[PDB]
Design an enzyme around this catalytic site. Structure first.
Site, PDB file in Angstrom:
ATOM      1  N   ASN A 102       0.834  -1.190   0.000  1.00 29.69           N
ATOM      2  CA  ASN A 102       0.000   0.000   0.000  1.00 29.69           C
ATOM      3  C   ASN A 102       0.879   1.254   0.000  1.00 29.69           C
ATOM      4  OD1 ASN A 102      -2.361   1.786   0.652  1.00 29.69           O
ATOM      5  ND2 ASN A 102      -1.203   2.098   2.531  1.00 29.69           N
ATOM      6  N   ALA A 179      -4.226  11.956  -8.029  1.00 28.68           N
ATOM      7  CA  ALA A 179      -5.607  11.780  -7.589  1.00 28.68           C
ATOM      8  C   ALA A 179      -5.642  10.479  -6.795  1.00 28.68           C
ATOM      9  CB  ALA A 179      -6.543  11.682  -8.781  1.00 28.68           C
ATOM     10  N   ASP A 192      -7.812   5.754   0.287  1.00 24.93           N
ATOM     11  CA  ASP A 192      -6.582   5.351  -0.392  1.00 24.93           C
ATOM     12  C   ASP A 192      -5.407   5.663   0.545  1.00 24.93           C
ATOM     13  OD1 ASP A 192      -4.759   4.543  -2.348  1.00 24.93           O
ATOM     14  OD2 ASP A 192      -4.985   6.346  -3.550  1.00 24.93           O
ATOM     15  N   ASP A 200       1.034   5.222  -5.838  1.00 23.82           N
ATOM     16  CA  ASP A 200       0.074   5.641  -6.860  1.00 23.82           C
ATOM     17  C   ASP A 200      -0.157   4.501  -7.848  1.00 23.82           C
ATOM     18  OD1 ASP A 200       0.178   8.180  -9.535  1.00 23.82           O
ATOM     19  OD2 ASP A 200      -1.394   6.792  -8.830  1.00 23.82           O
ATOM     20  N   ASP A 202      -2.135   4.412 -10.241  1.00 25.76           N
ATOM     21  CA  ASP A 202      -2.600   4.946 -11.533  1.00 25.76           C
ATOM     22  C   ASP A 202      -1.335   5.028 -12.405  1.00 25.76           C
ATOM     23  OD1 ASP A 202      -4.797   7.338  -9.945  1.00 25.76           O
ATOM     24  OD2 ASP A 202      -5.369   5.510 -10.998  1.00 25.76           O
ATOM     25  N   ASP A 229      -1.693  -7.338   2.688  1.00 25.07           N
ATOM     26  CA  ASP A 229      -1.876  -6.342   3.744  1.00 25.07           C
ATOM     27  C   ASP A 229      -2.686  -5.106   3.333  1.00 25.07           C
ATOM     28  OD1 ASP A 229      -0.118  -3.723   5.161  1.00 25.07           O
ATOM     29  OD2 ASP A 229      -0.992  -5.275   6.441  1.00 25.07           O
ATOM     30  N   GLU A 259      -6.370  -9.047   3.796  1.00 20.73           N
ATOM     31  CA  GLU A 259      -6.868  -8.431   5.013  1.00 20.73           C
ATOM     32  C   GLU A 259      -7.663  -7.191   4.616  1.00 20.73           C
ATOM     33  OE1 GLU A 259      -4.459  -5.442   6.944  1.00 20.73           O
ATOM     34  OE2 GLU A 259      -5.213  -6.084   8.920  1.00 20.73           O
ATOM     35  N   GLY A 298     -22.319 -14.662  29.073  1.00 24.89           N
ATOM     36  CA  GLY A 298     -23.408 -15.582  28.834  1.00 24.89           C
ATOM     37  C   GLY A 298     -24.629 -14.930  28.216  1.00 24.89           C
ATOM     38  N   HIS A 404     -30.002 -20.169  23.059  1.00 25.91           N
ATOM     39  CA  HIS A 404     -29.198 -18.964  23.189  1.00 25.91           C
ATOM     40  C   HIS A 404     -27.834 -19.147  23.844  1.00 25.91           C
ATOM     41  CE1 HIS A 404     -30.882 -18.866  27.312  1.00 25.91           C
ATOM     42  NE2 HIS A 404     -32.014 -19.193  26.713  1.00 25.91           N
TER      43      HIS A 404
HETATM   44 CA    CA Z   1      -3.297   3.434  -0.784  1.00 26.96          CA
HETATM   45 CA    CA Z   2     -25.796 -16.985  25.634  1.00 26.12          CA
HETATM   46 CA    CA Z   3      -3.439   7.840  -7.954  1.00 27.55          CA
HETATM   47 NA    NA Z   4      -2.686   5.663  -4.133  1.00 28.65          NA
END
Ligand code: CA
Ligand code: CA
Ligand code: CA
Ligand code: NA
Length: 481
Positions: A102, A179, A192, A200, A202, A229, A259, A298, A404
């Protein structure tokens, strides 16, 4: 044979450079208990030797070059890691490498960049005019040089950063001409940007480079899969393409789990759809149900466990887990499943038919944080359940979630696995009994509680039913004696 994953690390392990050696020494133990795959922490150089690995400084330095004041990473050297992987493979255990793409942290130098500040609450909103800042965006890898890759990073390979070195100010800055990527989580308008220098996607050169590194990484360590990640902060179409690219180039299956941290099932289903279901996601919603049940003394309605989870709707695209490095004590997303309930949670993910279960290193060996509420080593309580999965959790499943507190399920067994079949019962409150069907083919057998919590056995009647018992706030898993 049932597959079982193990996250092989916790956040507070010591920075002693012995982790890869520990993993190697543990291969026999893991095979014995049915672990078939291990997810190892980020193996490349971070911002310093003690970096857990998410700072990601140099993806091509696997503890091989003298950079950031150290050759080894927190976990050890590249050779030690390769030796550990060889040991695991010799025992038929797969290895999944962590993929942190990232952002990039710990740049070697700053660069003068024109940027604008954006609203932290809505990153699509610009709240300043253009300003000249000094950003930590120049990565030239002084200790590695061009070995393995000659790609050098500059500000134009990123969309923004959260720090202006010239004024020592922490604000979210978007670089001139950039952007935020799409599609990514729409939290805060566009999520982002998370931390450090945001890549980036892009940028054509970046897209090609991260794909190339992915193949190099898989080949260099002879990985069998990946754990992705912080995917809610990375362009979804890119991730989809990256996974396909690495599989095409290596010709391997490359199981992959991402994730995507969201409490909301809807956001997870959108991510799966946008990536064409080519990889799995961690079942975050289920983790929060476990936490809630464990803290409500519980009062939690256990019938809720069958709904609102990824595994409930996408059985083959969910990696189920109890706790991890994000949820352990002291972390930003701390939501630890209380110890008394932990064995019940493990029984749920390890003995049911759907989902690819993951065992946490911190739960097996304890966590080493400095709080007064660290997780104790519970391997003695989990080992019997791992044995139940390895040898008995096979065949058709029958669910009994009609109360329950006390809920259970059975597995009829499969003729291809000798003496397989089981009956599990868990309760977050008072104990009791439940009559459950385990298959008429098991009629007349004497079954006993493999956890040792109950001493009296249960005999299966002529019509394949047994009356099983469980103690209060406990779990019992019956298998043929
Ligand atoms: Ca990012
Ligand atoms: Ca319960
Ligand atoms: Ca970008
Ligand atoms: Na980015």
């Amino acid at each position: 044979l049932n597959g079982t994953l193990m996250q092989y690390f916790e956040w507070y392990m010591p920075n002693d450079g012995q982790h890869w050696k520990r993993l190697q020494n543990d291969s026999a133990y893991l095979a014995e208990h049915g672990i078939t795959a291990v997810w190892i922490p980020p193996a490349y150089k971070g911002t310093s030797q003690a970096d857990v690995g998410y700072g990601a400084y140099d993806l091509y330095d696997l503890g091989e070059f003298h950079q950031k004041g150290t050759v080894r990473t927190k976990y050890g050297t590249k050779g030690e890691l390769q030796s550990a992987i060889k040991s695991l493979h010799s025992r038929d255990i797969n290895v999944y490498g962590d993929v942190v793409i990232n952002h990039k942290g710990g740049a070697d130098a700053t660069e003068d960049v024109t940027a604008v500040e954006v609203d932290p609450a809505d990153r699509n909103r610009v709240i300043s005019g253009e300003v000249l800042i000094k950003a930590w965006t120049h990565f030239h890898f002084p200790g590695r040089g061009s070995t393995y890759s000659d790609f050098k990073w500059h500000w134009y390979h990123f969309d923004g950063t959260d720090w202006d070195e010239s004024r020592k100010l922490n604000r979210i800055y978007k670089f001139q001409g950039k952007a935020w990527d799409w599609e990514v989580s729409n939290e805060f308008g566009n999520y982002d940007y998370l931390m450090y220098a945001d890549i980036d996607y892009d940028h054509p050169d970046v897209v090609a480079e991260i794909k190339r590194w992915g193949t190099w990484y898989a080949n260099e360590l002879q990985l069998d899969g990946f754990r992705l990640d912080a995917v809610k902060h990375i362009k979804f179409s890119f991730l989809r393409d990256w996974v396909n690219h690495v599989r095409e180039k290596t010709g391997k299956e490359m199981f992959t789990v991402a994730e995507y941290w969201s409490y909301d099932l809807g956001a997870l289903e959108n991510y799966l759809n946008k990536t064409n279901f080519n990889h799995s996601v961690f079942d975050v919603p289920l983790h929060y149900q476990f936490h809630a049940a464990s803290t409500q003394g519980g009062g939690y309605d256990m019938r809720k466990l069958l709904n609102g989870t990824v595994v409930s709707k996408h059985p083959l695209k969910s990696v189920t887990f109890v706790d991890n490095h994000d949820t352990q004590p002291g972390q930003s997303l701390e939501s630890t499943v209380q110890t008394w309930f932990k064995p019940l949670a493990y029984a749920f993910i390890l003995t049911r038919e759907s989902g690819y279960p993951q065992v946490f290193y911190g739960d097996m060996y304890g966590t080493k944080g400095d709080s007064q509420r660290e997780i104790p080593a519970l391997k003695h309580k989990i080992e019997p359940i791992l044995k139940a999965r390895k040898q008995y959790a096979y065949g058709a499943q029958h669910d009994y979630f009609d109360h329950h507190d006390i809920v259970g399920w059975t597995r009829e067994g499969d003729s291809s696995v000798a003496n397989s079949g089981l009956a599990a019962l868990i309760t977050d409150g008072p104990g009791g009994a439940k009559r459950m069907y385990v298959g008429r083919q098991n009629a007349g057998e004497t079954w006993h509680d493999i956890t040792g919590n109950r001493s009296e056995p249960v005999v299966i009647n002529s019509e394949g039913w047994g009356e099983f018992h469980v103690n209060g706030g406990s779990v019992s898993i019956y298998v043929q004696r």
